[PDB]
C-alpha cells in the first residue's frame, strides 16, 4: 500500500519503465506489456 520498502518501490518503478511502448523512431530502422489491472507483478 502507501508504505513500501525502498527496494519494492524501486522494483515498481522498474516495472513502470518497462511498461512503456516501443519508441516509434526505432520502428524505422511490444509483447511484454502488462496492464496493472489484468496481470499482477506478483511481488
Amino acid at each position: 500500500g502507501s508504505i513500501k520498502r525502498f527496494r519494492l518501490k524501486q522494483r515498481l518503478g522498474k516495472c513502470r519503465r518497462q511498461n512503456r511502448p516501443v519508441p516509434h523512431w526505432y520502428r524505422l530502422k511490444n509483447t511484454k506489456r502488462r496492464h496493472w489491472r489484468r496481470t499482477k507483478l506478483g511481488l
Partner: protein
Amino acid sequence: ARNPKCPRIVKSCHSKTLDKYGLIKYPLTSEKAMKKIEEINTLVFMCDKRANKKNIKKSVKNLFGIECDKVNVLNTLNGDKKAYVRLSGEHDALEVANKIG
C-alpha cells in the same frame, strides 16, 4: 592492532564514489518547479538515488553560488532523487536560475 607488511588491496584508480558532477544531475523544469523558483526561491534538482541531504547541499555549494537553508528530498518512481532546495534569504533563486540557464 594491525601492522600489515603491505596492504591487501590498493585501488590506485580515481575514486568511483560520486562527485558533485554525478551526484547532482540536472535542474527540473516542469510547471511545478518553475512555480517554486518564482514564488518561494526553491530550486528543484534531480539527483542520484544515493545522494544524502548533506551531500546534496555540498554539491549545490560547489556547483553554484548557492547557499541552501533547507533541503527536502524524495525518491521518484523513475529511480531518481528529486531535491527541493530552499535558498537562504540573501539569494534570489530566479537570478541563480538565470545564471545556471
